[model samples]
Target: GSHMTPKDDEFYQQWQLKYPKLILREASSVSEELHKEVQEAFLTLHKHGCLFRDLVRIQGKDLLTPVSRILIGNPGCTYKYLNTRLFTVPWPVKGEAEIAAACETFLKLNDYLQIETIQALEELAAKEKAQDEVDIKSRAAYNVTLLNFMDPQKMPYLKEEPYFGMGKMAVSWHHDENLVDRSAVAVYSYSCELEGRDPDIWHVGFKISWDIETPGLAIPLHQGDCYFMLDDLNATHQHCVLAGSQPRFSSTHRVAECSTGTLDYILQRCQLALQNVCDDVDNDDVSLKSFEPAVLKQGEEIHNEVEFEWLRQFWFQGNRYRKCTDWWCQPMAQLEALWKKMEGVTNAVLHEVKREGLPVEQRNEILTAILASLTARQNLRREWHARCQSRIARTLPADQKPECRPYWEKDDASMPLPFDLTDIVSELRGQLLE
Candidate 1:
């Protein structure tokens, strides 16, 4: 599992021929202003406690452990990574202006890196006598951005590995998964001072995914440096980060392609839960009723508790609610049961339609109607959730209040669902009557 140390420039050139998709640009490749802006953005995010360690199980480790280095990211769309469901948390309303400014600068840098990567990939394709299939204009944009922060003080487990020599393992060996097929990943590095001096040199080690016997190659990354692993490089090779004595920050941008089933299921569950909440309140089961001092207080408390639970499960991804209070357990379980019942009913109906000799056209119509209903329900749920956050805010202390903003409320249209459903009620009425 050790790599062969060779002259960095010599090895990089040789590997460039072998792996045409690999491209690296040094610190001076980008303007000093751009570099400083990117660095400041990372620092701002870190200062705000946005970068936190995720619960993950490494390759060989048995017990689940928080990663030594901290990370935060926007999945762009809902998906799971490192066994955790990924979603973006909104910046606090108080300091949103500052955070938003940093994010804008960071995104501008991302755009630069993405454009550079595509051009390099196209050149490589032409040089290798391959058809330039990567259309720069129509290619998948980088939707996912992951920011990683590594400090020697934070990484107590950092020890010299044989492969890295003086450098320690910052990130373990792994190939990117759950990404758009044949898409490129761009990574930018920023080195930071530990106390006063610059940290020791670090390298990104890469090896053939299938060949464990062969010695791996290392690419040194310095401040303001960036690299791209294009096309099949992620599939063909595994890479890891080796760090030195100081702090470092890197942002990895990629197009995370989610499975159709996962997206549909999450959307469905969110809708169902929201609808259930509404039904409960309308029936006066969870709603505030009496105006008497004691009764009003009691009702508000109960209502707030329920709302908090919903926000925890749906918005917060139940991160720290594994052992929720006993009072909330039954209600949560009942809500989940209702979702299952709805799913079962729809599935049975679909199955029966198929088995009952229905015409293909009719069956398609029924499926479309079901999909339309689900979409309408989900949209309504989103609206309800947005308004309900204000009520929930009254119950939370200032610091504990949720971000309240939806993930889709952003400039990137890629993060939102692409299509709208037709008005199912009107279509059904016309078809049935005619």
Candidate 2:
């Protein structure tokens, strides 16, 4: 609005004439004070019931990938989207807790508008029943809420605890209506930083990507802005929040058709189920099967079988694996020294293999050939494991050095083999003889 607002109908008429059937509006706004209040409320709510799994949890591996989130809602309410399903752990409330109160307020704010919107739509549907009766049945309601914490700074994940620093989260393009039927959504945005600082550095907004037909739109959601998605547009287009230079907080309210109640009922069961919260969603929903958690290690179960089969890509081949993360925080000489010693060990082992009936020249020639093959395989083993450490370290913070141990490292002796080296060696022995 670099220009003046329309003071007359002619201006408005001309605009409507150009673009027809677009229901975009700024329905309301909340103060920065109120936005923070609501944010802290949910922050408090999730304090005890927080769950952080990789975004790739759908594939069943907590790969510690980028972008992580947690959710809470009324009792019996569960959010099922993609391969991930989250159950509400009774709502959290402690005698007049601020977070508990704000949750109630946030719920009512959306609920009132939802009831009004549904009633208006119901009446409108009656008139178009002959033309579109099926549309009314697929209408979605908003219930559960997900407070996503975005990391925009690319901060190093605490490789041990696996935590991303605030202001360092990333989210790819996706729509809101993935799981439940959602007709409308109310989103409140706020900054985690206080005043006298750069507001732009601490803001998180959204971008709408239109398909081939329409051009995309980028909208920066300012602090205290509560934007409502109306007229079933929530289902039509996909949108995502852009990572901010600084920390940002958003409270998104969605309608869940099924829930016992809010607040007291939520707090009541959360305490009772504290010990059994993870299994809460599994109690009734059959689709949320209690299958084996992704196969982190190889095993025989068919489900774990699926996991192992997928992980085959990361395993190493003979003479192909090497572990070398020394450039960052380790010494190169250490690696060279180890490889040299392993070479001697391999030659000694081959020299020990012999048969009395074989001629000395034949035995010597066989030992020489075996030594060459096994040496090459050993070098391949070193390179393969070396590359693994490098790849893993690339995603890590520069200061964090990777695990640079070879196949024969004492620490790795008890660990599972990177690949079937036993079979690789056996097959080579079977055909290596001329």
Candidate 3:
């Protein structure tokens, strides 16, 4: 039930010859029980607002736009392809047994995919070479898992003219830019049927990176199907996803080899930034410790502060005042400056790590410090924001006060807080230790 043009078939034949390690597995290749488990986990995560579209600076454009799809993944990992930061899932605290169960299911699926991909690659190497010279398992583990969710209801813009009467483009053409050299990428696809609409049959389209004249090839992916592009396939070929009719999700596992020095520098800079903001609060005599519960509860009469009002307008009122640019522009400028500094550090660290491998002991030390700093920074910002909001609430009338609710209680379509890195710090530490 797959459709492809004659030109697409021609390209597919040539593509297979060029990339010998490409592996594709259909629904029948996986056990039914595992399929059901993964499908339910994905649905639960999506329903809980775990998958969120990121506001990213689009490449070659001066504007910031939300990505076409929603995604969730390991924290602190930068998906350079989209220029977006992937934050960790919101882990449940002690009393939330329901969220804990959902997180457990998600983690299980992640673990299984990593293990399964490695074994599949190992078997491929042995069969192709007729020897076990390459120790595939000993290489860097696939430490990053990005789950992409695409619901047609949420993304109405994707309903464009179908590509050659096949399907609309879900993802644009590009090779993964952030993966380790020669490492493989594993992708698992799933589809969810809506009440009255049929599920879509998606396709992964591939074309030679250097050739512009040749038509691209595609492989239709259905529920429970998985694929792997091993070794140099990612380097030589560019790929995109095309959507059919239904909501779809994909789990992409990669060996995103980030250097210990780079991570250490990022964490250090983040801690400094948080401290800088806290110092401003201290100087203003508005630190979190200075706020009394009684004063907040009694609604102390106070005039509105300029900066506080700006923050409230931007964060809570959705930037209602169009004339004032300082609310968003100033903060965004500071963010851009931080990103520029980190970019240089990341490049330098990568170069040095490649020339002389960083010691495992040093890596562990960096990771340990990062975890501590992450936790401290997260708590400091959360407490600081709570105080700020309480002050703002006291100044406003009862009905005028913004709704104070946690992210989980908000609508599923609400944008996620990009700054929170609390939940994923431990997870990243465990992965690096492994």
Candidate 4:
């Protein structure tokens, strides 16, 4: 943690000092009834297959494929870990179904963690000096539940995991996103097997991204337990878990504030994913093909929903002014037209699925093609975001200008401009600064 200088490592030191190596609170506080409900719920749904998530970075490097990451929650809330783009699977509605119960329990747990986090922040704010007040109290609201499944056999695209000695050379270290103001992250271990294993989890101060020799702490987290990484500490320290033979199922709840429009849009997408779920898919059986009807159609529906929302969040910030044309307006309009055209095709696909679906053998291939089509459109949206805002011409009259703050301040009042309407990825760079 030795990267600071005398003149003003003090500034960085102030925030780092406020964060403890790790904070431990009561465990297994989740209701006992909820426990049985949750355990049983996961037993039934999403019991097979892995979610392969793309891990795209803001920097130039692009990892074309996604890695395995299990996630579920309200839609539109996304997280990137080790470059994995984690999207929330729509929360299931309450019903007799196990998926419903599990979704209910997971959401309750998310709320519970946020409440604990709020109190934790309040306690820290009172104890710390004024310098830490804002960072301490302005923690985000938890909105999504990210579940990590560690069954070796079910790991994405793998028959066996290569053996690696559990020692100092185990895993790389990194902090959560500093750009998004990620303050509090809640991790709940549903299961873990660590007997006779070295302590795999460690946390060093935010000052250093590497060098284990630097001071840090290894916190032990076990089944039915919760851990909250509070404050801006997530930005200040690097934390990592080393490899272990024992399988682990843990949920990391993330925080984000969604506008009403955004939430409505998210729910619509989530519903799309939730609609085609196989009725009888369970732990005793993993085959999605044997379901009552239209199984692969279900896959297409969900993937399209996720991909659509992903494009929305990745490309549009939804901060449009009342008068000026939104920088994202044209691209979104284009997407809408494309979407309508696809809607006709997808509806026909699903209708055929209901009566005489594609051969059971062709489900995965058909679903993959459906997803590819949606992905191609998403890629186009990002491309359009790169064009110039000046050429886009989102002009507004003097008297009807929006009440909201200008997208960005400009040096010349006569010809002010918002962030350029360039490529989607670059717009994010400018957007983040705003």
Return the top candidate by TM-score: 1
lDDT of each: 0.54, 0.39, 0.50, 0.45
RMSD to native, candidate 3: 17.3
RMSD of each: 15.0, 17.1, 17.3, 20.9
Worst 10 residues of 4 by lDDT: 316-325
Worst 10 residues of 3 by lDDT: 298-307
Give the Å error, residue 118, model 2.
Answer: 4.9
Give the residue spans of candidate 1 off by over 4 A.
1-10, 57-76, 89-95, 130-140, 159-167, 194-199, 259-265, 268-434
lDDT per residue for candidate 4 within 1-434, as digits (tens), equals 22221233353454346445335554557677765655555444436332323333336443322123445665434554543334455564343244445667778777677777777777766665456555544464666666655453343442211122223312235565523374688777655443322434321123334444443333345556677777665666766554344555666776543442243464465445434433343222122323332544454454444434443333322222111122334434444433333343444443443445456445434444454444454454343343212222133223321221112334544222222223432432342353
lDDT of 3 by residue, 1-434 (tens): 12343334354666556546667878797778878877887776666544544333354332222232322234333343454333233222233344345545545655676676677777776777683334465332565666787756556466432333345677776788677777778888886642211226677877677764555556778788888887778888888777657778887777775552123334444444333222342122222222222322111111111112222222332222112112234443344344333222222222332344667665554444334444553564464356335543355433333332222223433322234545555555665767
User: How would you order the candidates by TM-score, starting with the best?
Assistant: 1, 3, 4, 2
Per-residue C-alpha lDDT of model 2 across residues 318-397, encoded as one tens digit per residue: 11111211111122233233233323323223333433565555544444444344434545444434444554435643
Ranking by lDDT: 1, 3, 4, 2
Alpha carbon lDDT at 398, candidate 4: 34
Q: What is the TM-score of each candidate against the true structure?
A: 0.59, 0.42, 0.54, 0.48
Name the lDDT of candidate 1. 0.54
Error of 4 at 344 (Å): 18
Best by lDDT: 1
